[PDB]
Amino acid sequence: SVSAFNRRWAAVILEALTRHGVRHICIAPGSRSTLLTLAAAENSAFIHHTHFDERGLGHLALGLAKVSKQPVAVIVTSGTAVANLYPALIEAGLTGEKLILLTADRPPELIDCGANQAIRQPGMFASHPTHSISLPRPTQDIPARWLVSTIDHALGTLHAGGVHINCPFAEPLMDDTGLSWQQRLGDWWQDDKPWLREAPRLESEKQRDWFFWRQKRGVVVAGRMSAEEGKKVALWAQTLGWPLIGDVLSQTGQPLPCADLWLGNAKATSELQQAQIVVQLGSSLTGKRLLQWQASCEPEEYWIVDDIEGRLDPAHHRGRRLIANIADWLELHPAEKRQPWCVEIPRLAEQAMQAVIARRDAFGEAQLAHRICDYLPEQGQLFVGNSLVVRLIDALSQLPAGYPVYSNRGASGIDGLLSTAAGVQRASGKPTLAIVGDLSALYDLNALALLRQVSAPLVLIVVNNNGYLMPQNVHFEHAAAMFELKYHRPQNWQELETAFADAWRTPTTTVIEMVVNDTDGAQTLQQLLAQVSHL
Amino acid sequence: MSVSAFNRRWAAVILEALTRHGVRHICIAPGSRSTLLTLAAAENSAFIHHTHFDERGLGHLALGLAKVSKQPVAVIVTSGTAVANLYPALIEAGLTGEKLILLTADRPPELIDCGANQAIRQPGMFASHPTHSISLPRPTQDIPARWLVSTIDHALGTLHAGGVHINCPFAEPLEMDDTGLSWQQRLGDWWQDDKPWLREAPRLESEKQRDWFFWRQKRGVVVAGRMSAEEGKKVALWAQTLGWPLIGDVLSQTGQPLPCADLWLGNAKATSELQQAQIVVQLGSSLTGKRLLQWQASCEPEEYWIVDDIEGRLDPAHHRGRRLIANIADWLELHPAEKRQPWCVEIPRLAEQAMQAVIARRDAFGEAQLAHRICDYLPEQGQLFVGNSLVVRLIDALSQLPAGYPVYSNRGASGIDGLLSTAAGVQRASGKPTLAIVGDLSALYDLNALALLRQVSAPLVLIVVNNNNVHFEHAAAMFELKYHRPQNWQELETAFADAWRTPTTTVIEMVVNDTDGAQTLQQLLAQVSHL
User: Fold this and answer.
1) What does UniProt report on the pH dependence of this protein (chain B)?
2) What class, spelled out in words, does domain A1-200 have in CATH?
């Protein structure tokens, strides 16, 4: 019986994932995946998640992996369902999320010969996966200990990113056929561990000349890192005396706020030319000015510390790329009290924040961005789309140390922000504020279906500047209502404060739509930038 | 010096090259780094522009335009995941043959793998799915213009079917001084010409089968699947001329003279006449019916032939036989029929009885009924866009669609992921009034393409067969589309009366059970298996 064996074959694949940390599982309905689905429904170790848009399912997985820092499975049916995993897959491969995708395949008898829901799947994602397994047609003449060891190889040696696992099943898909095959794994069925542990660690080693470099004029730059990390970096820089430029994604507390303004002042840039070393911890910097400054700074040595692989410095400084847990790194390269060498930067920053304050009253996109610690859920988290309002938050707010932030800023796609925030919220269980533009809200409209189901209040701010028949000036009321969500389109700050009060009250998602122009935002920034640069 | 003014002319040329090969429609999205191709295509007045914000949707919209018009259609997108969202349309094309030309804009290669923003590895991304893949180098006036136009010409010229992926890096930035300009004039008077630079256009076709005059006297069965509307008729003639039975699929537009095949294929008196069949000729591919699929899996004719304009094996049962690549119209001309007496005695009896069996269940307000009575609602001189959904299994099993009335489908890999936005592509290409039916699931899946359906050159009705707790009333309202949810045949007729007057999309949601529709079919399968 082909369909009894094909079930043991799947159950064997699922049980192994379980031994590498996989708890969350994302499924969508489909008439061929059934095997792996069935198999995962029987396995009591998994949290189930679903969504009918497969693109959105990949993002929802990405959300979860993002916050939980654990690997996360996705199961899908054969055909175009699979291609749709491609965005989240690509993003993961750039930021580290362990997405394990199990793609059910037609068997290889049935490829390239006109069958339904049948396409060429192995290899499908080119080099985007960290690993790609392309499982063979199931047969009892390959031992279970081969199959689990292949899974084990991939998950075990996975430092970061996605793993495509194509899973063909015989056709058509109730008795004792896979049984002694499964039995040959013995008391492995009762164990915590993988069948074959292979988890080498990838890690840069200790910089032996740190004790020299830590006495020079360095500058610290903080990118995306864990919230604990922001805090750790915050002291480590303070302890050293080096200015810290910290990015919205950093969670450092931003002890020199508004760097996108103040890096424009020649008094500032000319204090930095004097820098000998630049340690940047994490990556994906947000600001135009910080990106530019970084492109142009000259230092004797450039360092980028981060647990991701590869070049991260798009201007290609002479310097080092150090692969490490940031927190571990800082313990390994510890700071020592030295009095700060920068004297103007700290004034400029203070002043540049006074200049942003002076401009808080007007009800547009910059002021919302400036006022945004006002609106964070207590014990909450922020998620941040890829849209001017996030450059604005970075330029103009000073977000709390240690307060969690998330984003899809690997490739900064705008195609999955609602689904991702869904995952992001479901993972941690926390109240969530998520900020996004109208195109992103329209791109991923039906993940509103998702944001119905959330374990704690989620507020989605949609900044809408919108942008046979006359065009097309779209809003988000009927959307919120299509999916039974609360909606508020506050006309001013009182209405915004009220709409928040309402929204923190129950565990559902509430849409708050702030309508603004295409220019006020960019402009207030340019004006502030010009003001700050003269002072 | 000016890099920008030349990256302009590099783009201008790629686009103009395309113009020489049938491309008129270009579908585009808002984008940071595809500015250059966007702009070259805007200053170029051979193109019809179409636009959409969800790149997955765009791919399907072009799949739409290309499917109907049969001419290649270009797509432009900015660098990053916008590009990945092209995968599904690209795949489908590869199976159905649409010519999607993907211009994907890309960070220049100094910027790849170094944590630059919105930068990913693009060459290679779509693996084996496109038919030609091109990785254009970093733009320089050191590579002459003739090369770039020729590289294009070769890729378009030699393309039988499916997508081409032209990845185009541009050096940053975007003086507009004259920097491109002599470089372009080395092309000389090509610029005013109407023909490619290089004409490389081999034709691909199987040769007249020299033994047809023998097999055509044999006891043949004709299966017809997706072909053109003219084709459906030439096939309906031919099959009648020979005396062979025609099993005619919802996508065949053959008139379906032996209607309800899905019902009667399940009756022994017909399985048995079909066993007597010594040759089978299947023209087109992607058969729909569950029975016709099985029947085809187990038939054991002396020979199985498939005629289609597309390469590859198409018989997923692997019969001894032949796979002939040809335009069907042409094929029929190169293998005409000789009038001959029908060998089929019992099959026409059972299909009349089939229909008449369906007809007595024509009353109840459900999906199976709505499938059955779909011709009442066909817009006159219109086109049918059918989704991938039980309800379209019902059209094919329980209805009989008029000969040569145009159907269209995404049935290469049958995803349910871009049906609305394919539907818009389909209305816009031909200008016709258009009916489209889909499931709730489909409609949610590609929900945001309601934005495209706002925009039609003629009325579009989107019937949405919803089978349960969301309803489409507010989606329709978001996009300022008319909406109905009829509760019976009088409410449904009223809905339609309106929807035909104007160049807009009217959404019509029919609510049903998860079960009626299949029960109705099971039950009708049985009653027919008993006469």
Assistant:
1) Optimum pH is 7-8.
2) alpha beta
CATH topology identical between B1-202 and B203-340 = yes
Fold annotation for A339-535: Rossmann fold (3.40.50)
CATH annotation of B341-531: 3.40.50.970
Q: How far is B135 from chain A (nearest CA, A)?
A: 15
CA distance B248 to B233: 11
The four Cα atoms A232, A234, A236, A240 give a dihedral, to 10 degrees, of 180
So what's the architecture of B203-340 in CATH?
3-Layer(aba) Sandwich (3.40)
Solved using: X-ray
Are residues B402 and B375 in contact, defined by beta-carbon separation less than 8 angstroms? yes
Peptide bond into A172 cis (omega under 30): yes
Write out residues 446-505 of A within 8 Å (CB-CB) of B: 446, 449, 468-469, 472, 474-479, 481-483
Query: Domain coordinates of chain B in residue numbers?
Result: 1-202, 203-340, 341-531
Q: How far is CA A488 from CA A435, A513, B60, B189, in A?
A: 15, 6, 33, 61
Report the alpha-carbon distance of residue A427 to residue B220 in Å, rounded: 61
**Beta-strand (E) ranges in B326-432?**
383-386, 407-408
Euclidean distance between CA atoms A287 and A263, whole angstroms:
10
Residue B293: Cβ within 10 Å count: 16
Q: Which residues does A403 contact at the CB level (< 8 Å), separation at least 6?
A: A227, A251, A376, A380, A381, A382
CATH number of B1-202: 3.40.50.970
Of B127, B445, B447, which has the smallest distance from its Cβ to A126's Cβ?
B127
Q: Where are the beta strands (DSSP E) in B115-207?
A: 132-135, 164-169
Architecture in CATH for domain A201-338: 3-Layer(aba) Sandwich (3.40)
Indicate the SS3 state at residue A434. strand
Q: Is B57 at the interface with chain A, CB within 8 A?
A: no
Q: What is the DSSP letter of B362?
A: -
